[PDB]
Amino acid sequence: APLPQLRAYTVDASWLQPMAPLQVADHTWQIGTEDLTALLVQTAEGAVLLDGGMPQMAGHLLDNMKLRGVAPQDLRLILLSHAHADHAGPVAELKRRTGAHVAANAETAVLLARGGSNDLHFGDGITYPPASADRIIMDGEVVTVGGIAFTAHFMPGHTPGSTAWTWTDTRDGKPVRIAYADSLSAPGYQLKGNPRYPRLIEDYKRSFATVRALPCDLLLTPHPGASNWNYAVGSKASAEALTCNAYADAAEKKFDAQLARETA
Amino acid sequence: APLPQLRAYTVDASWLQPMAPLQVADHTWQIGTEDLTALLVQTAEGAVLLDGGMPQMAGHLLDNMKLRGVAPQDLRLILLSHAHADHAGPVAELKRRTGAHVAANAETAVLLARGGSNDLHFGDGITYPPASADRIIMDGEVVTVGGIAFTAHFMPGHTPGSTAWTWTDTRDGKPVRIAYADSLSAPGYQLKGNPRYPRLIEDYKRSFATVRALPCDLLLTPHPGASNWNYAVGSKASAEALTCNAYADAAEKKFDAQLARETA
Amino acid sequence: APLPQLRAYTVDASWLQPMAPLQVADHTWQIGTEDLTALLVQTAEGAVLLDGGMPQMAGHLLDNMKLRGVAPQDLRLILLSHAHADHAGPVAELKRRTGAHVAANAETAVLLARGGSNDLHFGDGITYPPASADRIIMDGEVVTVGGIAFTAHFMPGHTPGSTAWTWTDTRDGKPVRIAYADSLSAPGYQLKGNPRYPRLIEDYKRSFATVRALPCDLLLTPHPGASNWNYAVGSKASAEALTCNAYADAAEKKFDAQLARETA
Amino acid sequence: APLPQLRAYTVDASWLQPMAPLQVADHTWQIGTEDLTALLVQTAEGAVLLDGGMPQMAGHLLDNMKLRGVAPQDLRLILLSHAHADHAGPVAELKRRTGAHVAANAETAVLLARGGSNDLHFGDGITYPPASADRIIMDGEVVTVGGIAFTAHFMPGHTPGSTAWTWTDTRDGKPVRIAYADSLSAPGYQLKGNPRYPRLIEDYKRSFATVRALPCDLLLTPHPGASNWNYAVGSKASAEALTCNAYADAAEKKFDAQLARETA
Ligand SMILES: [Zn+2]
Ligand SMILES: [Zn+2]
Ligand SMILES: [Zn+2]
Ligand SMILES: [Zn+2]
Ligand SMILES: [Zn+2]
Ligand SMILES: [Zn+2]
Ligand SMILES: [Zn+2]
Ligand SMILES: [Zn+2]
């Protein structure tokens, strides 16, 4: 009986279903797949990418950038929600092909640098090509590109380095406060007495409160279904989207129920 | 008028004054200099080093280990308070010469990896040879070597990755709770509205409360004068040592006064 | 039509077929699988591992070390032939579980650090958990553990960092010169005018001559079939093994034929 | 008697003497100091920097780029001769302030990543802020920016990763072959039987032959005096410059004399 073969990270088909750019605000565009968010922000001094999706999405992202008039060398910065394979997947290839820099907090930087391996909960089950962060970000630090200011808000739990990003765009010149909040799920995590993450419960509980207080007129999430976006229906995509409060409340109720189940 | 020459990091002579090993408890020894702490813990399965001091102290540390019967290959693990040049200085050389591993949190790992350069407050003024952390530690995580359990307690402020370490030794078989608490100083830091560390004040304030609640019968600090140790007087070294409460209280009063001065 | 799913690196079953330790010489043991070499060298000051095989072989290797009386903390050093997933696969996990250091040349170190990704020929098709090299080795440099001296011989081609290792063991006290020579295959490589490896042909040709001149009484290779070893037949495993000259000659004839085919 | 204080890397004043940009060819400019080369190549798609000089030269380089009409974000790529502090000094700061990428061979990448520490000959005596290489280059590989093609030629000896760069510029539309050849000095090196560089002599001897055969109408070197440039005399700076043959011949004669002295 030989040792088992390695298994690939397979995902639902809708995560891999390309879509054309969908405008979110004057400078902000969804350019990922129907079920994975990847936000392009276009400024007068270059573009910013927030998340990339799965590793095989690199070519799709570059195609959608080209549709927006963004050449590979116009991509200045890549920001991340968290460094799991389904959001940071293509970062290594994008850096090689664009010359962009990556900015991340220390926790995200170290997980990105090992390609998602030795994950606190998944081990080596979900890996991707490693990448190096070029700028280390602190909680509340402001990153500016072309006059648009992105503020980082640390929200540990789903990963130690999970981060929300806020910025103000316009909608026909009128200001709109966008919040790109990270996942608050704990998929199959051991929550209580986890030797690799002893303070996991306390971090999640603080993070629910962080998300509740974000300045936000429009909430988006790395998995669009988590904030009730439907990228497939085009102009009506944001009709049913949740507020920050409703997203945090829904996430905390699932968390408390999962914690009670684990206890029992 | 040419550009200025580079300047070396020069320190008080007492920081560089070697001393013979001083026993702290049954398994725990101070083996650094009169004014820089470096703790050796000897177990049945190898030795642990907490801090190393300045870069030029590598040979002294190895000599003092040899006096304790610890061969270079018996050093299993290096733990750190924080990754400034006067505590993590010799880590790169010690790893090369012993085969030890380094364990650190993500913040300390990334600062260690750039040799203290691009420091949030010191820039490139105080650098040292870079080293890589082999094990990333989470807050409250327990590291065990030879049955002795070290628990990490994150106390950000002096650096983002500043860490206290606690363990229980014996004194002639009777248990003694040791706390190696990091610095709580802010030497020349901009505290308020610092763009590189927006939440510095909140982190320090939480850290004062963390240090107050450490389980501790005997407090030690990377700079021994900060907890009123006097390594030079041998057996009487710990006579005047502060409690955790007194150390945190004294540190917070200096912090509040410095913050009021900066305001004015 | 969605993007393709990621594909796992699947290998022949015999590569994953565990075997008990097979003695090669007084201090040297094959402890990998029937079709992947992993050599354990036991000295008076600890053990050395040369190669590890596939990522999922970490537990098997630790089990076979335990059968030899080698505890996890007795493993001092890991050396590599080359940093493809089928030889460096488990290195990251072995370092975490043993405290060993890894020594490698600069080329191997950088490929190991990206987990085999962005391979000059395979792209991201064959990746594994990244690891960091602790000691960088130069051509002809001698690494000594417990009195046993390993000499590195660079033989670029299969990877830029491909390395042969030589050492002298005994067979009942009588000296035997062992050569662990790396692969000389070019599986599906573009050899001529390769933009990522412009001097590939010149490097292979020099490497054939390097292997021919190795001091060698007993040749072993990362893939045992390449030097006509048969690990499955126990005591007769080395009966048909090739000399260094015959291995290099056979490899060069395959290389020249492949190069003529590519031309045509 | 305390341990010695750390010593700073001090250099001759002329190495730190700023100068205004000096045109070398239609697209190529010397923008470093009177005694340290730093070449700016301006293309239609951004600028390339070859070497930076000492760590404290970062601000000067950015000022001289601005005089040439090159904004910080127009700097696309940094190439290096070798990763000693007097040529790679400011690379870390330049990357942070420009968003440029660094391309280097594996040897140079690993020395750059440790900030020049653990140098084969200098130990930790001459360090600088570490930086990460973003693109790894192979011997003979071509790097293209804005249509201008740079070819790497490995010339190990002064460091293992020492590299010459060649490209074709114009002088009023007429082609001129430029060679930026690395140092061939061995300042205070142990050449024979060096345990850290066993094949040093063979590498130098091959490198002399590599430099002799470079395609070259105009030779430049990281230290301008080595190829008889005089940056201080402006238009006459290149009057007495050596050919590639004369530079290699002069370097080999010094090398042979130094080797005979070491023997005696
Ligand atoms: Zn996730
Ligand atoms: Zn996800
Ligand atoms: Zn400090
Ligand atoms: Zn200090
Ligand atoms: Zn291979
Ligand atoms: Zn193989
Ligand atoms: Zn040099
Ligand atoms: Zn130089």
3-state secondary structure of A195: coil
Minimum distance, in Å, between the CA of residue B108 and any CA atom of chain A = 9
Question: From CA B135, how far away is CA B151, in angstroms rounded?
Answer: 14
Q: Calculate the alpha carbon distances from A1 to A209, C2, C18 in Å.
A: 51, 36, 8
Q: Are B3 and D60 in contact (CB under 8 A)?
A: yes
- Beta-bridge partner residues of B169: B176
Q: Calculate the alpha carbon distances from D9 to B7, B98, B194, D6, D13 in Å.
A: 8, 28, 31, 10, 12
- Give which of C177, C165, C183 is closest to C247, Cα–Cα: C183
- Give which of D36, D51, D45, D96 is closest to D72, Cα–Cα: D96
B180 CA → ligand 1 middle, Å: 35
D85 CA → ligand 7 middle, Å: 8
User: Taking CA C222 as the corner, what is the angle to CA C218 and CA C226, rounded to the nearest 5 degrees?
Assistant: 70
Q: Calculate the alpha carbon distances from A137 to C48, C50, C193 in Å.
A: 40, 40, 42
Q: What does the DSSP 8-state code read for residue C219?
A: E
Chain B: touching chains (3 or more CB pairs < 8 Å): A, C, D
Nearest ligand, CA B51:
4
Question: From CA A238, how far away is CA A241, in angstroms rounded?
Answer: 5
* Burial annotation A176-206 (CB, 10 A radius, 16+ → b, else e): bebbbbbbbebeebebeebeebbbbbebbee
Nearest ligand, CA A160:
1
Task: Confirm or deny that A158 is annotated as ligand binding.
Answer: yes
Residue type at position B77 = L
- Inter-axis angle of helices A106-113 and B106-113, to 10 degrees? 70
Q: Which of residues 72-91 of B touch C (CB under 8 A)?
A: 73, 76-77
- Give which of B73, B100, B90, B95 is closest to B36, Cα–Cα: B90
Rg (CA), chain C: 18
- Beta-bridge partner residues of A148: A145
Kindly give, in sequence order, each residue whose CB lies less than 8 Å from that of residue A262, ignoring residues fewer than 6 positions away: A190, A191, A192
Nearest ligand, CA C159:
5
- Inter-axis angle of helices D58-67 and D91-98, to 10 degrees? 50
CA neighbours closer than 13 Å in the CB half-sphere of residue B126:
16
Q: Is D74 a catalytic residue?
A: no
Question: From CA A35, how far away is CA B89, in angstroms rounded?
Answer: 48
Strands D135-136 and D142-145: unpaired
Rg (CA), chain A: 18
Q: Which residue has the tokens 């060819």?
A: D25
Q: How far apart, in Å, do the first and last CA atoms of chain A sit?
A: 37
Q: Are D213 and D227 in contact (CB under 8 A)?
A: no
Question: From CA B157, how far away is CA B160, in angstroms rounded?
Answer: 6
Which two tokens mark B192?
Answer: 């308020």
**Quick one: which H or E segment has residue D207?**
helix D200-212
Chain C: touching chains (3 or more CB pairs < 8 Å): A, B, D
Which two tokens mark B152?
Answer: 């990490």
Q: What does the DSSP 8-state code read for residue C126?
A: S
Q: What does the DSSP 8-state code read for residue A229?
A: -
Q: Is D82 a catalytic residue?
A: yes
Question: From CA A90, how far away is CA C124, in angstroms rounded?
Answer: 11
Distance of CA A233 to the CA centre of its chain: 21
* Burial annotation C25-34 (CB, 10 A radius, 16+ → b, else e): bebbbbbbbb
Kindly give, in sequence order, each residue whose CB lies less than 8 Å from that of residue A34, ignoring residues fewer than 6 positions away: A14, A15, A17, A19, A231, A232
- Give which of C133, C183, C188, C132 is closest to C160, Cα–Cα: C183
Minimum distance, in Å, between the CA of residue C65 and any CA atom of chain D = 31
The beta strand positions in C44-172, using DSSP E, are 46-50, 75-79, 101-104, 135-136, 142-145, 148-154, 163-171
Kindly give, in sequence order, each residue whose CB lies less than 8 Å from that of residue D63, ignoring residues fewer than 6 positions away: none
C150 CA → ligand 1 middle, Å: 44
Which two tokens mark B215?
Answer: 């389980």
Neighbour count for residue A113 (Cβ, 10 Å): 23
Residue type at position C132 = S
Could you write out the three-class secondary structure of chain B?
CCCCCCCCCCCCHHHHCECCCEECCCCEEECCECCECCEEEEECCEEEEECCECHHHHHHHHHHHHHCCCCHHHEEEEECCCCCHHHHCCHHHHHHHHCCEEEECHHHHHHHHCCCCCECCCECCCCCCCCCCCEECCCCCEEEECCEEEEEEECCCCCCCCEEEEEEEEECCEEEEEEECCCCCCCCCCCCCCCCCCCHHHHHHHHHHHHHCCCCCEEECCCHHHHCCCHHHHHHCCCCCCCHHHHHHHHHHHHHHHHHHHHC
Neighbour count for residue A262 (Cβ, 10 Å): 13
3-state secondary structure of C251: helix
Q: Which residue has the tokens 């392009």?
A: A40
Kindly give, in sequence order, each residue whose CB lies less than 8 Å from that of residue B55, ignoring residues fewer than 6 positions away: B85, B89, B90, B93, B128, B129, D6, D124
Q: Is any Cβ of chain A less than 8 angstroms from the Cβ of B198?
A: yes
CA neighbours closer than 13 Å in the CB half-sphere of residue B74:
16
Binning chain C into helix, strand and coil, the percentages to the nearest 5 are 30, 25, 45
Chain A interface disruption, residue of C19, C112, C124, most A CBs within 10 A: C124
Q: Return the C-alpha torsion angle B122, B124, B127, B131, nearest 10.
A: 110
Q: Are B34 and B19 in contact (CB under 8 A)?
A: yes
Q: Which residue has the tokens 């760069």?
A: D165
Neighbour count for residue B44 (Cβ, 10 Å): 9
Which two tokens mark C236?
Answer: 């007769």
Question: From CA D194, how far away is CA D197, in angstroms rounded?
Answer: 5
Strands C46-50 and C75-79: parallel
DSSP assignments along D40-90, one per residue: EEEETTEEEEE--BSGGGHHHHHHHHHHTT--GGGEEEEE-S--SHHHHTT
Distance of CA D73 to the CA centre of its chain: 22
Question: From CA C131, how far away is CA C147, in angstroms rounded?
Answer: 27
Which two tokens mark D161?
Answer: 């990763």
Residue type at position D136 = I
Closest CB to A73: pick one of D45, D95, D135: D45
Between chain B and chain C, how many beta carbons pairs sit less than 8 Å apart?
Answer: 24
Question: From CA D4, how far away is CA C251, in angstroms rounded?
Answer: 56
Q: How would you classify residue A246: left for phi > 0, otherwise alpha for psi between -120 and 50, otherwise beta?
A: alpha
Known catalytic residues of B are 82, 84, 86-87, 158, 189, 223
Q: Backbone phi, then psi, for B111, in 5-degree steps? A: -75, -40
Neighbour count for residue D166 (Cβ, 10 Å): 18
Question: From CA C123, how far away is CA C102, in angstroms rounded?
Answer: 24
- Beta-bridge partner residues of D46: D43
The beta strand positions in chain A, using DSSP E, are 22-23, 28-30, 39-43, 46-50, 75-79, 101-104, 135-136, 142-145, 148-154, 163-171, 174-180, 218-220
Question: From CA B163, how far away is CA B181, in angstroms rounded?
Answer: 7
Task: Confirm or deny that A82 is annotated as ligand binding.
Answer: yes
A97 CA → ligand 6 middle, Å: 29
User: Taking CA B54 as the corner, what is the angle to CA B50 and CA B56, rounded to the nearest 5 degrees?
Assistant: 120
- Experimental method, per PDB record: X-ray
Annotated binding-site residue numbers of C for Zn(2+): 82, 84, 86-87, 158, 223
Q: Which residue has the tokens 């304790």?
A: B68
3-state secondary structure of A71: coil
- Give which of C78, C102, C82 is closest to C184, Cα–Cα: C82
DSSP assignments along C40-73, one per residue: EEEETTEEEEE--BSGGGHHHHHHHHHHTT--GG
Q: Which residue has the tokens 């939480």?
A: B206
Classify the C-alpha dihedral A190-A195-A197-A202 as positive or negative. positive
Rg (CA), chain B: 18
Q: Which of residues 32-61 of D touch C (CB under 8 A)?
A: none
C14 and A3 within 8 Å at the Cβ level: the answer is: no
Strands A135-136 and A101-104: parallel
Q: Is any Cβ of chain A less than 8 angstroms from the Cβ of B141?
A: yes
User: Taking CA A161 as the corner, what is the angle to CA A155 and CA A166, rounded to the nearest 5 degrees?
Assistant: 50
B76 and C99 within 8 Å at the Cβ level: the answer is: yes
Kindly give, in sequence order, each residue whose CB lies less than 8 Å from that of residue A183, ignoring residues fewer than 6 positions away: A81, A82, A158, A162, A221, A222, A223, A226
Q: Are C221 and C157 in contact (CB under 8 A)?
A: no
Q: Is any Cβ of chain A less than 8 angstroms from the Cβ of C17?
A: yes
User: Taking CA D85 as the corner, what is the angle to CA D80 and CA D90, rounded to the nearest 5 degrees?
Assistant: 70
Which two tokens mark C110?
Answer: 């950088």
Which two tokens mark A91?
Answer: 């970062």
Resolution, angstroms, 1 dp: 1.9
Kindly give, in sequence order, each residue whose CB lies less than 8 Å from that of residue B57, ignoring residues fewer than 6 positions away: B16, B32, B33, B36, B38, B89, B90, D3
Q: Is any Cβ of chain B less than 8 angstroms from the Cβ of D140?
A: no
B224 CA → ligand 4 middle, Å: 10
User: Taking CA D236 as the corner, what is the angle to CA D84 and CA D227, rounded to the nearest 5 degrees?
Assistant: 35
Question: From CA A62, how far away is CA A38, in angstroms rounded?
Answer: 12
Q: Calculate the alpha carbon distances from A257 to A205, A207, A225, A226, D52 in Å.
A: 14, 17, 20, 17, 58
Minimum distance, in Å, between the CA of residue B2 and any CA atom of chain D = 4
Kindly give, in sequence order, each residue whose CB lies less than 8 Å from that of residue B21, ignoring residues fewer than 6 positions away: B29, B30, B31, B40, B64, B67, B68
Q: What does the DSSP 8-state code read for residue A100?
A: -
Nearest ligand, CA D86:
8
Q: Which residue has the tokens 């596939």?
A: C54
Chain A contact set for C96 (CB, 8 A): 118
- Beta-bridge partner residues of C50: C39, C79
A55 CA → ligand 6 middle, Å: 24
- Give which of D90, D159, D70, D168 is closest to D122, Cα–Cα: D159
Q: Return the C-alpha torsion angle B152, B154, B158, B161, nearest 10.
A: 80
Q: Which residue has the tokens 């999922």?
A: C56
- Give which of D5, D34, D4 is closest to D19, Cα–Cα: D34
3-state secondary structure of A114: coil
**Quick one: which H or E segment has residue A88?**
helix A85-88
- Beta-bridge partner residues of A175: A170
Q: Active-site residue among D87, D119, D153, D197?
A: D87
Question: From CA B13, how far away is CA B15, in angstroms rounded?
Answer: 5
Strand order in the sheet with A28-30: A22-23, A28-30, A39-43, A46-50, A75-79, A101-104, A135-136
Q: Are A36 and C3 in contact (CB under 8 A)?
A: no
Q: Which residue has the tokens 């280097």?
A: D104
C195 and D107 within 8 Å at the Cβ level: the answer is: no
Q: Are D50 and D27 in contact (CB under 8 A)?
A: no
Q: Is D158 a catalytic residue?
A: yes
Q: Which residue has the tokens 């090689």?
A: A96
Distance of CA B8 to the CA centre of its chain: 22
Question: From CA B97, how far away is CA D259, in angstroms rounded?
Answer: 30
3-state secondary structure of D180: strand
